PDB file of C-alpha atoms and ligand atoms in Angstrom:
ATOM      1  CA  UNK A   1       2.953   1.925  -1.039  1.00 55.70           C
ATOM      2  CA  UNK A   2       5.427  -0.558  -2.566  1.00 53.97           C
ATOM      3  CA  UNK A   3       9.045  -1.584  -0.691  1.00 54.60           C
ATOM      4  CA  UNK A   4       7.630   0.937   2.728  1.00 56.27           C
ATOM      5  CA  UNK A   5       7.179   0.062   6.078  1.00 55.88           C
ATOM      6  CA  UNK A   6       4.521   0.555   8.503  1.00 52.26           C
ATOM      7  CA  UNK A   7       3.714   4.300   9.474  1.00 51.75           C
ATOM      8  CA  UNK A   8       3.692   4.628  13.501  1.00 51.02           C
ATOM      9  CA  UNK A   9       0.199   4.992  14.042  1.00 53.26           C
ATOM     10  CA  UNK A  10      -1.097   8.143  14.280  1.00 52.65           C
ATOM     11  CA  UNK A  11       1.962   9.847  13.680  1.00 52.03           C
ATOM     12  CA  UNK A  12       1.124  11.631  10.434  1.00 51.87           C
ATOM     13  CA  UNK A  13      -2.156  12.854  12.066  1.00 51.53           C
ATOM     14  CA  UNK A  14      -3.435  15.211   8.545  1.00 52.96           C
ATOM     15  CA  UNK A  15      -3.853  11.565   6.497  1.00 53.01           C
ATOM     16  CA  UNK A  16      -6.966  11.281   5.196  1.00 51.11           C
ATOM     17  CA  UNK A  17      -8.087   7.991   3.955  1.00 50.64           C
ATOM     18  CA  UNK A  18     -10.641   8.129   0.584  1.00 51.66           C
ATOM     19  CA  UNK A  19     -14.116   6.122  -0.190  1.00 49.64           C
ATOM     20  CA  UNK A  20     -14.766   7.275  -3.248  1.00 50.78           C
ATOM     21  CA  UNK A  21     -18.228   6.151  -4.864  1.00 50.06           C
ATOM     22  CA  UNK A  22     -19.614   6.313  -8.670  1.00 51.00           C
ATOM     23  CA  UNK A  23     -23.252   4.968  -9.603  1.00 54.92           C
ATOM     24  CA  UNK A  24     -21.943   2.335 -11.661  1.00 54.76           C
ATOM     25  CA  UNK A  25     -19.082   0.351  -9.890  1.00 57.17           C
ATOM     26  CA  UNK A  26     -17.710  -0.523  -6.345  1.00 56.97           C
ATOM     27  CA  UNK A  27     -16.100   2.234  -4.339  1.00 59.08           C
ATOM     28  CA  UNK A  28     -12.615   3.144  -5.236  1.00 61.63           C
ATOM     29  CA  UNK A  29      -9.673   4.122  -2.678  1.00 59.79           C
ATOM     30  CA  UNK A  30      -7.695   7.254  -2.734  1.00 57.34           C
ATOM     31  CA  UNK A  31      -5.547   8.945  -0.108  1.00 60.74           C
ATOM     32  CA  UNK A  32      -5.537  12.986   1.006  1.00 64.55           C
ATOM     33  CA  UNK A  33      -4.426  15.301   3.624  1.00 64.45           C
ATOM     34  CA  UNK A  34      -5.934  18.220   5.806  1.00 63.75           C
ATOM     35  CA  UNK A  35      -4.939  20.779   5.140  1.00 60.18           C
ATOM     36  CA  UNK A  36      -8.305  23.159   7.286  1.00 62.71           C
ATOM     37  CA  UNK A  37     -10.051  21.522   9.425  1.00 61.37           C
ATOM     38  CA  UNK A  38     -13.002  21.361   6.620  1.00 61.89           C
ATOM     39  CA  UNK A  39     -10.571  21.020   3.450  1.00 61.51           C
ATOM     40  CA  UNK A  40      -8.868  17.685   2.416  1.00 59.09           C
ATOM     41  CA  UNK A  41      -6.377  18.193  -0.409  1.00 60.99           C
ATOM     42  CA  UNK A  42      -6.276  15.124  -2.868  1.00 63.09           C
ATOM     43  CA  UNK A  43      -6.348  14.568  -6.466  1.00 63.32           C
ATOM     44  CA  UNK A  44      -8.767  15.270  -8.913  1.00 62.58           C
ATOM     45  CA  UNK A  45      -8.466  11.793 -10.558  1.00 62.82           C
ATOM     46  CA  UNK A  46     -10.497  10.524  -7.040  1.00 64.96           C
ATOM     47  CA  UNK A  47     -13.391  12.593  -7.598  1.00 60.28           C
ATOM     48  CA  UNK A  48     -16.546  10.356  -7.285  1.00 61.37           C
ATOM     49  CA  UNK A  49     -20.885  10.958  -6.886  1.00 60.08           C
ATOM     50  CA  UNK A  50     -19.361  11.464  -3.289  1.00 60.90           C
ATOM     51  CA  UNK A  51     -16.586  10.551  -1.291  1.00 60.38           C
ATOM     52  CA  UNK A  52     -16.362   9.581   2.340  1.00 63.43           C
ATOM     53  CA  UNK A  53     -12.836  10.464   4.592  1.00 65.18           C
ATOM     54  CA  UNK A  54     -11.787   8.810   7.411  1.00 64.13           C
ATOM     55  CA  UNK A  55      -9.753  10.740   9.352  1.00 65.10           C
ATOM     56  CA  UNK A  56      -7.310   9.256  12.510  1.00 64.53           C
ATOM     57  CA  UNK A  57      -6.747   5.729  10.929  1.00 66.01           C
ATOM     58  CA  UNK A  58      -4.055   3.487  11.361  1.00 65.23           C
ATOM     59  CA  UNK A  59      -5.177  -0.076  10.698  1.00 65.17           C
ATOM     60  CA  UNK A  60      -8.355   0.842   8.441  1.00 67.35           C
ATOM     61  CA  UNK A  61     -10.357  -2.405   9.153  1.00 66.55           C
ATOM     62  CA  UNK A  62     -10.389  -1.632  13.131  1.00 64.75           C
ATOM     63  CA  UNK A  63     -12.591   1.136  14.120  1.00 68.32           C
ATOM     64  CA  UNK A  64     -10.990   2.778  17.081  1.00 71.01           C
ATOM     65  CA  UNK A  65     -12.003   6.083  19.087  1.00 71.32           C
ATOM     66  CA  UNK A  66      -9.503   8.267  16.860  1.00 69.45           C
ATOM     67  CA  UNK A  67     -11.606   7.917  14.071  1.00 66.03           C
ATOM     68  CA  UNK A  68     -13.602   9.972  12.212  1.00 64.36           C
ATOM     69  CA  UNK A  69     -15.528   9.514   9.303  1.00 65.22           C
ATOM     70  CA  UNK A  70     -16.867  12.971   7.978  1.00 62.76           C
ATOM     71  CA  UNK A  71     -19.304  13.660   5.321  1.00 62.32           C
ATOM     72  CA  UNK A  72     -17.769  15.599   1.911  1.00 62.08           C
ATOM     73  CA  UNK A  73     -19.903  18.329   1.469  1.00 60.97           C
ATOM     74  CA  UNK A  74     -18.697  19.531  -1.886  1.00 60.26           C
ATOM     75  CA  UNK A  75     -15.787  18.446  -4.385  1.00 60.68           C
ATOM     76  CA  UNK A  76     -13.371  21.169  -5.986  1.00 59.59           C
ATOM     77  CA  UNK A  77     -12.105  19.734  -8.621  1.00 60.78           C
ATOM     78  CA  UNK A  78      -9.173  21.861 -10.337  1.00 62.20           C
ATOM     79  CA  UNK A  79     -10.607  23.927 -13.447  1.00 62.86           C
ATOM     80  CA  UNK A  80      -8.164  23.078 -15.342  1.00 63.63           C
ATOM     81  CA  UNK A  81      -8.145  19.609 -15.019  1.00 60.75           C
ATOM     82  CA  UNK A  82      -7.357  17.035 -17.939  1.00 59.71           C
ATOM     83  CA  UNK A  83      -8.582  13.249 -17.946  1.00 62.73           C
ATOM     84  CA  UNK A  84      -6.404  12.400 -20.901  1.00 61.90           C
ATOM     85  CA  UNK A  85      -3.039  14.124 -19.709  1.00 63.03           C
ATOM     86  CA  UNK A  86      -3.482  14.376 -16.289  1.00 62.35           C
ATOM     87  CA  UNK A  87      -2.462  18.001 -15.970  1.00 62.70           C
ATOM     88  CA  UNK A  88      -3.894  19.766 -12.762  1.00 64.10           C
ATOM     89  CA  UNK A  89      -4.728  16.530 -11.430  1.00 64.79           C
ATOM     90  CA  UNK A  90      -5.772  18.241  -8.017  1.00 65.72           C
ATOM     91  CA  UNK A  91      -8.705  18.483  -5.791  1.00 63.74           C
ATOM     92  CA  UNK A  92     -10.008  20.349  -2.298  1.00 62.50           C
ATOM     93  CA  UNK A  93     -12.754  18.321  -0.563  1.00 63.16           C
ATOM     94  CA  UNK A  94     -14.784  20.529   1.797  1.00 65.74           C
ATOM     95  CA  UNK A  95     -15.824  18.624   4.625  1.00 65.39           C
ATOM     96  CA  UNK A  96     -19.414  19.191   6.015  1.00 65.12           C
ATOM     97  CA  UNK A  97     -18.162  20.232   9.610  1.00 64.97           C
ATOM     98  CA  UNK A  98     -15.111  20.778  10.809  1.00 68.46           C
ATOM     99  CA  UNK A  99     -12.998  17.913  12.023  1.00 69.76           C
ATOM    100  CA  UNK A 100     -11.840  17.963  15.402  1.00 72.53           C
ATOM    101  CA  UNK A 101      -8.710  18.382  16.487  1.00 71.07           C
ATOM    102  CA  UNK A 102      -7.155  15.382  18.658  1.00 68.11           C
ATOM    103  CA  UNK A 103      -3.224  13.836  19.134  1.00 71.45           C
ATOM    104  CA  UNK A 104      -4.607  11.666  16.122  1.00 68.38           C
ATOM    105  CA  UNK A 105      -6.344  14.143  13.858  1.00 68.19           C
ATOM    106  CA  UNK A 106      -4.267  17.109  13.130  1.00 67.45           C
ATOM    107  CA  UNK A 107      -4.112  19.802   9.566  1.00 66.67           C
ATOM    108  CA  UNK A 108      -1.050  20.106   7.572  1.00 65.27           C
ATOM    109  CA  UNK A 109      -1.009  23.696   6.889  1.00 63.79           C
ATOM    110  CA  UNK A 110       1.270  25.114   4.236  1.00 65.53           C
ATOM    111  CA  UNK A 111       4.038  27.892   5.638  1.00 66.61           C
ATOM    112  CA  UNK A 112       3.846  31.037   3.690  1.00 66.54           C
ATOM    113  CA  UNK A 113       7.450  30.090   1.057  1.00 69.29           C
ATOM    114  CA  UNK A 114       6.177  28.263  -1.630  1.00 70.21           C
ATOM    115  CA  UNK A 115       9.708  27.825  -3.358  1.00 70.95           C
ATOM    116  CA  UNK A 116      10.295  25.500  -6.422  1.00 68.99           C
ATOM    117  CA  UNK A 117      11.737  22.191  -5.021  1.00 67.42           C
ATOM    118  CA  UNK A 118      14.803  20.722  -7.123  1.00 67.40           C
ATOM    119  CA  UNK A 119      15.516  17.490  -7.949  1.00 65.36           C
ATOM    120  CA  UNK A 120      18.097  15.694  -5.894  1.00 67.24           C
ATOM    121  CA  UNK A 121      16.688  15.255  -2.390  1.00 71.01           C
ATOM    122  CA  UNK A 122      14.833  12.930  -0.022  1.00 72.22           C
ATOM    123  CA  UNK A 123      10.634  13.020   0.685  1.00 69.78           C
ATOM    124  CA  UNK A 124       8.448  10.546   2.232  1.00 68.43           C
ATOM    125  CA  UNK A 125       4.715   9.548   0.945  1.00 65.59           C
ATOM    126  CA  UNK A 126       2.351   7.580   3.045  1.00 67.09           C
ATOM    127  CA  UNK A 127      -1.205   5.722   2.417  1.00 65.84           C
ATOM    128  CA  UNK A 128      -3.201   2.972   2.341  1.00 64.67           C
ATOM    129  CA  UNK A 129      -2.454   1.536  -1.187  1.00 65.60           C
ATOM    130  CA  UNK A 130      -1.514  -1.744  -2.825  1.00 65.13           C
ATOM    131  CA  UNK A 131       2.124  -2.647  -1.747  1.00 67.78           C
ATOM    132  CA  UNK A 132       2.505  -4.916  -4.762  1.00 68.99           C
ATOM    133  CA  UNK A 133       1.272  -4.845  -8.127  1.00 68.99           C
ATOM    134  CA  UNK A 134      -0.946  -8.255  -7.611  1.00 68.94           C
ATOM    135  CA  UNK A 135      -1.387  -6.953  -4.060  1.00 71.37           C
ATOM    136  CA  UNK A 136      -4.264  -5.360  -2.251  1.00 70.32           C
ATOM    137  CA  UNK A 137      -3.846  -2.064  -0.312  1.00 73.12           C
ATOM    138  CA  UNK A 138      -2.619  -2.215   3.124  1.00 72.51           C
ATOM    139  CA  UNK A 139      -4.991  -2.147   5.819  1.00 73.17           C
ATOM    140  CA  UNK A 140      -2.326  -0.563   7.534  1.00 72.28           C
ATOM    141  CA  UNK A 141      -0.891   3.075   6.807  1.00 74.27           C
ATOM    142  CA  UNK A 142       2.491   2.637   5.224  1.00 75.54           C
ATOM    143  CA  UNK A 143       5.135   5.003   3.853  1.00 74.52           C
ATOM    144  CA  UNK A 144       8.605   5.071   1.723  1.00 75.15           C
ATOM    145  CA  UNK A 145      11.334   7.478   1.472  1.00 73.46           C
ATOM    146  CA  UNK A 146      11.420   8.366  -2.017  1.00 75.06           C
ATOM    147  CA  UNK A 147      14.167  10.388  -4.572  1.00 73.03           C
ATOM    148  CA  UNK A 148      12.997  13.117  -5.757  1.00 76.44           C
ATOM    149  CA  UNK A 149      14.259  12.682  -9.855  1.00 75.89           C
ATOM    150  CA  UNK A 150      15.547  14.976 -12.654  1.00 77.95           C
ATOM    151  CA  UNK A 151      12.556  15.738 -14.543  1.00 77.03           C
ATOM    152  CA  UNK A 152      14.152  13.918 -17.597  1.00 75.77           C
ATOM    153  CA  UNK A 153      13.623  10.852 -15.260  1.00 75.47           C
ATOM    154  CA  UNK A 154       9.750  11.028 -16.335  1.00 75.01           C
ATOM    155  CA  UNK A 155      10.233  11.718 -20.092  1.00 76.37           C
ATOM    156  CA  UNK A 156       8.305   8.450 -20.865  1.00 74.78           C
ATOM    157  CA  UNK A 157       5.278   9.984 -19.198  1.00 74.95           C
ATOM    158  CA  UNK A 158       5.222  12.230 -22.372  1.00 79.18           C
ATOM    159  CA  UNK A 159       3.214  14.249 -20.713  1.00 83.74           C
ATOM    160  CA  UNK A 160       4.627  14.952 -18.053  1.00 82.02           C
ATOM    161  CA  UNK A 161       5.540  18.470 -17.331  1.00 82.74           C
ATOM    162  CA  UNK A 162       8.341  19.688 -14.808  1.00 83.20           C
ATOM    163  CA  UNK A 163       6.997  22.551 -14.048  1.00 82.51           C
ATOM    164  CA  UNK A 164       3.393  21.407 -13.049  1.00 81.88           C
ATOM    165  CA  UNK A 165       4.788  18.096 -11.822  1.00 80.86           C
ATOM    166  CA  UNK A 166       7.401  16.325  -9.470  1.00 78.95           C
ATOM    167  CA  UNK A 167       9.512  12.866 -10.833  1.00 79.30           C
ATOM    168  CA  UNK A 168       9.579  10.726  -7.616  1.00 76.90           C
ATOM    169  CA  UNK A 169      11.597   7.919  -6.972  1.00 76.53           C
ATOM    170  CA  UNK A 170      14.728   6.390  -7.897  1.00 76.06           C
ATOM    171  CA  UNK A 171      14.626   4.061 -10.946  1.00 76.67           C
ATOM    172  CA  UNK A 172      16.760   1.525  -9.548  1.00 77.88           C
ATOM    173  CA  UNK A 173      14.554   0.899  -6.436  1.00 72.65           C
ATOM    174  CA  UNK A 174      11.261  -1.198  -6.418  1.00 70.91           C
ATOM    175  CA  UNK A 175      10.327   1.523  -3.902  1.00 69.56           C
ATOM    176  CA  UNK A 176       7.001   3.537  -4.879  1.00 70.53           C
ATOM    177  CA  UNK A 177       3.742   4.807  -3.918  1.00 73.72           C
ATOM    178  CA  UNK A 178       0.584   2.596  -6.063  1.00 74.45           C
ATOM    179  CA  UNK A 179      -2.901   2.617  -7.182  1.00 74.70           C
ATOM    180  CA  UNK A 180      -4.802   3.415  -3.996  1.00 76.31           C
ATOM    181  CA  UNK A 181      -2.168   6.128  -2.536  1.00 75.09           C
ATOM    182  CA  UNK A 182      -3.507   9.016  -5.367  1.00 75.36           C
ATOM    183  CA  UNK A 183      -4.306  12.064  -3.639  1.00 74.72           C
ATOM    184  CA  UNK A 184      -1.745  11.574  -0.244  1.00 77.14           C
ATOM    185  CA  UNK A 185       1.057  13.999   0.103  1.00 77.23           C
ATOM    186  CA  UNK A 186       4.946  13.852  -0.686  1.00 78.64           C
ATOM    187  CA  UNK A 187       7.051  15.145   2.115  1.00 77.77           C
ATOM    188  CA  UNK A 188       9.975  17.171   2.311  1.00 78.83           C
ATOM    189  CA  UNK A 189      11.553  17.640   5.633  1.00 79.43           C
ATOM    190  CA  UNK A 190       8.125  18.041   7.143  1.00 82.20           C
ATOM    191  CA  UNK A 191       6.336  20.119   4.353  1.00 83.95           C
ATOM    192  CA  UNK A 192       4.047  18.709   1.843  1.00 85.39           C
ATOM    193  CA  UNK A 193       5.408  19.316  -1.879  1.00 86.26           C
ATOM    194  CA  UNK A 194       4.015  16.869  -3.764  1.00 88.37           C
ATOM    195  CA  UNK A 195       0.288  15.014  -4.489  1.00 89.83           C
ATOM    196  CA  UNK A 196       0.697  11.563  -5.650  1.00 92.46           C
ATOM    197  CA  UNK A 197      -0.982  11.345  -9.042  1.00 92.94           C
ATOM    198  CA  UNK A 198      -0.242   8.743 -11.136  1.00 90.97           C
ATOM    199  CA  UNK A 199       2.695   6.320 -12.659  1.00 90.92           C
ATOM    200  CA  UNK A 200       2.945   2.731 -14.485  1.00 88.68           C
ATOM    201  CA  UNK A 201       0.422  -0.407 -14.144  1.00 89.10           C
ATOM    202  CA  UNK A 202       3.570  -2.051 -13.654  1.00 89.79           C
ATOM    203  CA  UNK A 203       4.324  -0.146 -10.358  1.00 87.26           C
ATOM    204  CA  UNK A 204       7.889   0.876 -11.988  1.00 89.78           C
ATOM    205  CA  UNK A 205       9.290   3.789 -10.365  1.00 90.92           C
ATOM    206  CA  UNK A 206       9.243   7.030 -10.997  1.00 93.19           C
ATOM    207  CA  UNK A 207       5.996   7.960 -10.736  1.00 93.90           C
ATOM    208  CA  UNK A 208       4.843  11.830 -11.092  1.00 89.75           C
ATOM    209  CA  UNK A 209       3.134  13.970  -8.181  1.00 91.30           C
ATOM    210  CA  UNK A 210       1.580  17.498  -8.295  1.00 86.62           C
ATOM    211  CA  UNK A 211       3.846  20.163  -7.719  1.00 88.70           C
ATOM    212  CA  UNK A 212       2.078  21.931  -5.150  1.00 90.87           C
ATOM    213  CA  UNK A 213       4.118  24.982  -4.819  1.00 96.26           C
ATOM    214  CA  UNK A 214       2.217  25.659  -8.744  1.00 98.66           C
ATOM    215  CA  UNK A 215      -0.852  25.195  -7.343  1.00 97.16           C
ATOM    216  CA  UNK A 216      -1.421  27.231  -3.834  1.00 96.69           C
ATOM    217  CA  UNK A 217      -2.566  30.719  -5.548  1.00 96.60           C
ATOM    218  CA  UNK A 218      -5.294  28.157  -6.636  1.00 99.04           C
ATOM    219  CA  UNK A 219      -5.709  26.587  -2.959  1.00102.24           C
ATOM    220  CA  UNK A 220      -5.723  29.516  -1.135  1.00101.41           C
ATOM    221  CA  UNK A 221      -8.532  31.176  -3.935  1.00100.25           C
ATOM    222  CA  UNK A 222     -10.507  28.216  -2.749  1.00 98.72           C
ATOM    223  CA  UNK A 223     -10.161  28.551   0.798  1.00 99.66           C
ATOM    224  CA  UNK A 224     -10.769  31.800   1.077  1.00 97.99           C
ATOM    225  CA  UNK A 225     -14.107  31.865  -0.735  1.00 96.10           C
ATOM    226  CA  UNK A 226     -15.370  28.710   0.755  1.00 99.41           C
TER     227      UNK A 226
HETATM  228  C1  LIG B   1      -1.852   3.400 -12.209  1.00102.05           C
HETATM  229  C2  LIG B   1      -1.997   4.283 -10.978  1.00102.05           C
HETATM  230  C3  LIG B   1      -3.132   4.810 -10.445  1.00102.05           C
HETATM  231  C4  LIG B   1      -4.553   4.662 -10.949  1.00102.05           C
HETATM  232  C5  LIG B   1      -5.484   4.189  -9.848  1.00102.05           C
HETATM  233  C6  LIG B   1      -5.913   4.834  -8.732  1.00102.05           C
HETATM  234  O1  LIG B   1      -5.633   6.070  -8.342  1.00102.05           O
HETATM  235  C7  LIG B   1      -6.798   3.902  -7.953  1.00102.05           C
HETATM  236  C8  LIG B   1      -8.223   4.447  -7.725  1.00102.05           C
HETATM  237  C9  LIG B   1      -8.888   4.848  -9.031  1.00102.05           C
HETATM  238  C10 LIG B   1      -9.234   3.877  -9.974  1.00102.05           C
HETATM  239  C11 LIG B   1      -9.841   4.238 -11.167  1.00102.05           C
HETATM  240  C12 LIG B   1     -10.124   5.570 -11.415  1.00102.05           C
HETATM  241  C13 LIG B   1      -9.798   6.539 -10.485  1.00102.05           C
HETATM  242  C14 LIG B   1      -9.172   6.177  -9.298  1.00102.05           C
HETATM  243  O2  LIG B   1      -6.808   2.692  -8.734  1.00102.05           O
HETATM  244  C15 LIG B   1      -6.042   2.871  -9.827  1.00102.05           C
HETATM  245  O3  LIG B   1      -6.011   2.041 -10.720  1.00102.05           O
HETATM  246  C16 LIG B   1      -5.036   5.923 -11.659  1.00102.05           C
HETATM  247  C17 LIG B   1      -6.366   5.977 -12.067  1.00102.05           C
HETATM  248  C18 LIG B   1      -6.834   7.069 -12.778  1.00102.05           C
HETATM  249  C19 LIG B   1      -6.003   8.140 -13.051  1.00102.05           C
HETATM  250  C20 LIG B   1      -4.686   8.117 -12.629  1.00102.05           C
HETATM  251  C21 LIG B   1      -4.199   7.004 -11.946  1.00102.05           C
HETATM  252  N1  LIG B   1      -2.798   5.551  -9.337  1.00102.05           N
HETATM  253  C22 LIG B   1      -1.428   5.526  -9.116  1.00102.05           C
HETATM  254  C23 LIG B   1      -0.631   6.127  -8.153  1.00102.05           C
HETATM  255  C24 LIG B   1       0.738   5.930  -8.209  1.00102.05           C
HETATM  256  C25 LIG B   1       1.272   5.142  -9.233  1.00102.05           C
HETATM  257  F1  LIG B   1       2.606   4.960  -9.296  1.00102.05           F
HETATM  258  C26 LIG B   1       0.487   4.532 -10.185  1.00102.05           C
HETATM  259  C27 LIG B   1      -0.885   4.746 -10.148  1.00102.05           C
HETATM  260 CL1   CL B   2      11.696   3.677   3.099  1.00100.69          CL
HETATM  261 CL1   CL B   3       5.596   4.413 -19.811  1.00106.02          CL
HETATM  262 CL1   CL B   4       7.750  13.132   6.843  1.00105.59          CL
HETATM  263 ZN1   ZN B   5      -5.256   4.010  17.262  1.00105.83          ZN
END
């Protein structure tokens, strides 16, 4: 998270924090969000061999009681997913056991309205990532209030699409999430409408996020037959 401040800790109890490990370089670093108690919701782009989530951080380098680092049973990567356009770039991690609930460790769950969201207003995006673009990710959990854009706004991501995709953050602003906060969750007065996905090397904003609302008959087919 670039131009944020520091999240009160343990105040946005569903953040998930992402190991992700391939056989042939070190782990990577995405964020997430649970949404079940067994289901992290993150972006396909993160998908590893295997993945490890820590749930109940705050400052990631200081284990603490709240935390709790649960085994990824299996990775749902979306079908339709697309490693040259990024389409669909969206993933359910089911968790091994269930996580247990505590102030700290809490699910996200979506309310039954899954309305388009227009451009124009205000959402918030947390995680872990680098807060500069010759920066390394924050050991603490950060997050920015970000504009949600006119799709026009992302034209030079040609392919971006509106209607699979949201167009976060004002031009203007050096404000942005970053490599490292893929896969955490756009908020919208409380409800989670966006996935951070990807944006420029150069950390300029906007940057485009999953539309969710496009996506949960796909989440709940998943949840309901896993
Ligand atoms: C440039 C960018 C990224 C890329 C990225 C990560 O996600 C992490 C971990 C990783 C590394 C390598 C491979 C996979 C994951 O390190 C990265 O270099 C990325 C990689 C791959 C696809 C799509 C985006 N994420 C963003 C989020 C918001 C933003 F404004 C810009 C970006
Ligand atoms: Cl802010
Ligand atoms: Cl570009
Ligand atoms: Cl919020
Ligand atoms: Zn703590």
């Amino acid at each position: 998270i670039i131009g944020g401040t520091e999240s009160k800790p343990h105040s946005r109890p569903y953040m998930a924090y992402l190991e992700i490990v391939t056989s042939n370089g070190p782990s990577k670093f995405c964020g997430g969000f649970l949404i079940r108690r067994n289901f992290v919701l993150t972006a396909a782009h993160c998908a590893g061999r295997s993945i490890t989530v820590t749930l109940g951080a705050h400052n990631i380098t200081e284990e603490e009681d709240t935390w709790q680092k649960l085994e990824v049973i299996k990775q749902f990567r979306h079908p339709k997913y697309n490693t040259s356009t990024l389409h669909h770039d969206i993933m359910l991690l089911k968790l091994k056991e269930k996580a247990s609930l505590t102030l700290a460790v809490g699910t996200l769950p979506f309310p039954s309205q899954k309305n388009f969201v227009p451009p124009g207003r205000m959402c918030r995006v947390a995680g872990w990532g680098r807060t500069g673009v010759l920066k390394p990710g924050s050991d603490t959990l950060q997050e920015v209030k970000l504009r949600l854009m006119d799709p026009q706004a992302c034209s030079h991501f040609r392919d971006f699409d509106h209607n699979l995709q949201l167009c976060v953050g004002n031009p203007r602003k050096t404000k942005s999430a970053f490599k490292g906060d893929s896969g955490g969750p756009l908020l919208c007065a409380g409800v989670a409408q966006g996935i951070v996905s990807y944006g420029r090397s150069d950390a300029k904003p906007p940057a485009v996020f999953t539309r969710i609302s496009h996506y949960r008959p796909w989440i709940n087919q998943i949840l309901q037959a896993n």
